[PDB]
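Internal QA ticket QA-208
Title: Verify multi-chain structure generation after dependency bump
Assignee: T.L.

Test input:
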Amino acid sequence: MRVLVTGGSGYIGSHTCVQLLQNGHDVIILDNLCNSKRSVLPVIERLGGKHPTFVEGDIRNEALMTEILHDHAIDTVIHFAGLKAVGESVQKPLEYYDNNVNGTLRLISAMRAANVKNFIFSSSATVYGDNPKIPYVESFPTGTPQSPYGKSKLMVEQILTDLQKAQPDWSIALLRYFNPVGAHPSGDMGEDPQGIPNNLMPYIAQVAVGRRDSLAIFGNDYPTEDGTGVRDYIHVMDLADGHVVAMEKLANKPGVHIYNLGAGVGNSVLDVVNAFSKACGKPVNYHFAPRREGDLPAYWADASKADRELNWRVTRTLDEMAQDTWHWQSRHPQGYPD
Amino acid sequence: MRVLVTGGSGYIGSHTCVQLLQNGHDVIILDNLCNSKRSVLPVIERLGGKHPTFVEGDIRNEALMTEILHDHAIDTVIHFAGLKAVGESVQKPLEYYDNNVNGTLRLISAMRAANVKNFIFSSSATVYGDNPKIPYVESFPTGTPQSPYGKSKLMVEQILTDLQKAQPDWSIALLRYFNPVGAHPSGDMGEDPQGIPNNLMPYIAQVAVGRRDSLAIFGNDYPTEDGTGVRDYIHVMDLADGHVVAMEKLANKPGVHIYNLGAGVGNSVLDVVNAFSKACGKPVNYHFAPRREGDLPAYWADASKADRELNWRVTRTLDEMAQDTWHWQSRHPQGYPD
Ligand SMILES: NC(=O)c1ccc[n+]([C@@H]2O[C@H](COP(=O)([O-])OP(=O)(O)OC[C@H]3O[C@@H](n4cnc5c(N)ncnc54)[C@H](O)[C@@H]3O)[C@@H](O)[C@H]2O)c1
Ligand SMILES: NC(=O)c1ccc[n+]([C@@H]2O[C@H](COP(=O)([O-])OP(=O)(O)OC[C@H]3O[C@@H](n4cnc5c(N)ncnc54)[C@H](O)[C@@H]3O)[C@@H](O)[C@H]2O)c1
Ligand SMILES: O=c1ccn([C@@H]2O[C@H](COP(=O)(O)OP(=O)(O)O[C@H]3O[C@H](CO)[C@@H](O)[C@H](O)[C@H]3O)[C@@H](O)[C@H]2O)c(=O)[nH]1
Ligand SMILES: O=c1ccn([C@@H]2O[C@H](COP(=O)(O)OP(=O)(O)O[C@H]3O[C@H](CO)[C@@H](O)[C@H](O)[C@H]3O)[C@@H](O)[C@H]2O)c(=O)[nH]1
Ligand code: NA
Ligand code: NA
Ligand code: NA
Ligand code: NA
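Actual output:
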C-alpha cells in the first residue's frame, strides 16, 4: 500500500517505517524535524531495504497535506506527528493543543479533501485517565487526563470518532500505546531525545553511558510490590509490527478500531533498572526521590483484543528492550549526526 | 474599557454590544458574517447610542486577530463567534471543531501575542453532559456532551483552563448559557436564523407569523409535569447584562471564573407555547412528535453563584421573552435586510 507516515523520522515512526518498507509498502515520510534529524533517513532506507520518500513540512499545513496526499496517491495515513513532553505541556498548553489537536484536524481535513479514508492514530493509555481498574481494557469508558498532552490525545480520539460517524466509509484505528522502549536490534536506530530525557529508559541509558550521575526514582512508597511505579513496557519493534498489521488488516474496513498496544504485564522501576544493569554490565546508579506530579502508581494493558482481532502480540522481552537500548546508546553516544 | 467582541453581529453578541456601548465602553466587533448581516450594525449603534467599530474577518486568522488586538489596544475579549447548529455538528463535525476549537485557539494565541489577558467565553449547559442532578451547579464535574458542538465547547473550556494555569495573570470567565430567547424591547433587534430554526422560540414565532404550519413538540412522554421537555429560558437582554457585569467585575481578576447564566427555573415546551399564544393573540398551532435525538428531559440552572459573586440575576420574565420575540418577528418578518 501507499502510506503517508507523519512524524516518520521520530522514534516510533522511524522503526515503523523500517518494518513497512520490509513489507514492501511505498512510504512517504512527512516530518517538520522539530524533534528528529534528517540523518535518520539514510538509516531507515538501509535497514528498511527500500527507499522512503521524505517531505519536510508541518501537519498544520492543510494545503500542503492535501497536495502530498494526492500527489502520492496515498491509500492510508499513519499519524505519529505531534508534541509529547508531558511536563512541558503543562507549561505550554497552547503549543500542545495546536500541534496535536489542530495538527490532526488539519491533516484529516486534508484527507477529506483528497478522498483518503484509512487512518492510524498514535494514541495513549493516558486516555483512560485515573482508572482504578487495571489492566486497562478498550471497553472501559475514557477518563480525564491530567495534562494538556493527555487531554489533547483524548480530544483527537473524540474528533476522529465523530468524523467516522459522519463519514462512515472511513477506517480509523485508535492505537493506545503504553510505554515504548527499545531500539532496532542493529543498534543503529533508536530513541534520540534532546536534552534531559523525560522517560525512564533513556534516562537510565544516559546514566549508564556516563552522561548523568544517578537515576532519580520518583517515589518509593507506592502501593506496589517494591514501592516503585509499575508500567507496561513495550519494545518499539513490537509496536512497529503492530502498526504494519493494523494498517494491513484494517485498511478499508469501516469503523473506529480501538486497540491497546502493550505487553499486557507490568514492570516496576526497579525491574527496569535491574534489567539495564544486567544489559550494560555495571550497576546503574540510582536514588529515591519524591513522587512526580501526576504519576499513577501502577497500570498495564489488557492486550487480548489485539491478539484476538489482529493476531498480534508482543514478542520481545524486557531484557531485550534493555539490551537493544544499551547497544544503540553505546554505539551512538551522540545519537544522530547534525 | 476597550473590548473586542467576536461574533458581535450575531444574536447574543448584538444585544451585548448594545448594552456595552450604553455603559460607555469602546466596542470593536469582529465577525465573518457567516450567520449574520451587516444590516444589524446600524441598529447596534442606534440602540447602543454610540458607534462600534466593525471588522469583517475570521477568528481562525491568528495574524489578523493579533493585529486587531494591538491596533485597538484591546483590554478584554468577549468571544461569541463560532458555529452552534447541534444537528449539523453531527453531520459535519470537522467544521465545528475547526471553528470552535481551532477558532478559539487561534484567538487566544493572538491574545498571548498581543499581551491581552482578560477573556469571556460563550460556553453552554451542554458541558454538564447527562447530569441526573438538577439544577446544574458550577461545582459539578463536567460530563460528556453528545454532539460535536457540545464537545467542542467542553474542549475549549479545558484549553482555557490549562492556559490560565500556565499564564496565571489571565482572567477567564466561562459563562455557561442555558436557553437564550427574547429580543431587544425595541422590536428592532432580535434573533434572525436562516432557514429552518432549530430552537423552540424562533420556530414557534415562525408558526405564529404564518410561515410554518405547526410546531412539532419533540416528545410528550418525558418524566415531567406535562410530559414535554423542560429548560431554563433566559432573556437575551438579561444575558447581555450578565456579560457587561462579568466583564466589568472580572477584568484583571486572575482566575477561571465559571458561572451558569440562566433564570434558575424550568419551563416546559407547553409553558413556552402558551406564553407565546398569549403574546401573539392567537393559539399557536402545534402537534406532538417523537423525541428528538440527544434531548435531555429536564434541566435548569442553579444561578446562585452569579447572584452572590457578581450580584447578577435575571429580571425579564417568560412572558416578556415571548412578547419581545413576537414584537421583533412581527415588526421585521424578513429579519435584517440584504
Ligand atoms: N514515546 C512514547 O512514550 C509515547 C507513548 C504514547 C504516545 N506516543 C505518541 O506517539 C507518537 C510518536 O511518538 P515518538 O516517541 O516517536 O516521538 P517523536 O518525538 O520521536 O516523534 C514525533 C515526530 O513528529 C514530528 N513532529 C512534531 N510536531 C510536528 C508537526 N506539527 N508537523 C510535522 N511533524 C511534527 C517530530 O519532528 C518527530 O520526528 C506521538 O504522537 C506521541 O505523542 C508516544
Ligand atoms: N443561542 C443559543 O441558544 C446558545 C446557547 C449556548 C451557547 N451559545 C453560544 O453563544 C455564542 C453566540 O451564539 P448566538 O446565538 O449569538 O449565535 P449567532 O450565530 O447569532 O452568533 C455567532 C456569530 O459568530 C459569527 N461567526 C461564526 N463563526 C465565525 C468565525 N470562525 N469567525 C468569525 N465570526 C464567526 C457568525 O457570523 C455570527 O454572527 C456561540 O458561541 C454559541 O455557540 C448560544
Ligand atoms: O527519571 C525517571 C523517569 C521515570 N520514572 C518512573 O518510571 C515510570 C515510567 O515513567 P516514564 O518513562 O516517564 O513514562 P510514563 O509517565 O508512564 O509515560 C509514558 O507512557 C504514557 C502511556 O503509558 C504516555 O502517555 C507518555 O507519552 C509516555 O511518556 C513511572 O513510574 C515514573 O515515575 C522515574 O522514576 N524516573
Ligand atoms: O421545534 C422544536 C424545538 C425545540 N423543541 C423542544 O424545546 C426544548 C428546547 O429545545 P431547543 O430550543 O432546541 O434548545 P436546546 O436543545 O435545549 O439547546 C439550546 O440550549 C443548550 C443549553 O441549554 C445549548 O447547548 C444549545 O446551543 C441551544 O440550541 C427541548 O425540550 C426541545 O425538545 C420542540 O419540541 N420543538
Ligand atoms: Na507554569
Ligand atoms: Na546528538
Ligand atoms: Na451523517
Ligand atoms: Na431575511
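Spot checks passed. DSSP finds eleven helices and 13 strands in chain A.
Status: verified.
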